[PDB]
Ligand binder design. Structure first.
Ligand SMILES: CNC(=O)N1CCN(C(=O)c2ccc(COc3ccccc3)o2)CC1
Length: 121
């Protein structure tokens, strides 16, 4: 299964599934600073799933590993901003992270396998 380009549509489909998840709603668009005035005191690099989708559609990811790094930043930002492990929004982040990691593992494996096949000779 050695298509070097297949990851892109696989990531578009997984982002579609993430946007159907009620657990993604807090992570779809940027944090408003009027509502969370200290957010940028804690978070140096904001990230959200609309920014991930637009970067993909612009042709500004070279690999699914780069997309995976930005999605993982969404979740680490939630973990750093939460005042407790038991917050609503951080609890939604943990379920959505488990869903994402379950689905991205084959996308990464197939891509890396396809690159190794390309360089086999
Ligand atoms: C459009 N998206 C946003 O505005 N976001 C809000 C901030 N955020 C977080 O990841 C996060 C982690 C924990 C919390 C809030 O915790 C509370 C704790 C007790 C009472 C009320 C809230 O927010 C990203 C999504």
């Amino acid at each position: 299964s050695y298509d070097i380009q297949a990851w892109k549509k696989q990531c578009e489909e997984l982002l579609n599934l993430i946007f159907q998840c009620e657990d993604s709603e807090p992570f779809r668009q940027p944090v408003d600073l009027l509502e969370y005035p200290d957010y940028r005191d804690i978070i140096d690099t904001p990230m959200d799933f609309a920014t991930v989708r637009e970067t993909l559609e612009a042709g500004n990811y070279e690999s699914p590993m780069e997309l995976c790094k930005d999605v993982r930043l969404i979740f680490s930002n939630s973990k750093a901003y939460t005042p407790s492990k038991r917050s609503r929004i951080y609890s939604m982040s943990l379920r959505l992270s488990a869903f994402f990691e379950e689905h991205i593992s084959s996308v990464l494996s197939d891509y890396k396998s396809a690159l190794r096949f390309h360089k086999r000779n």
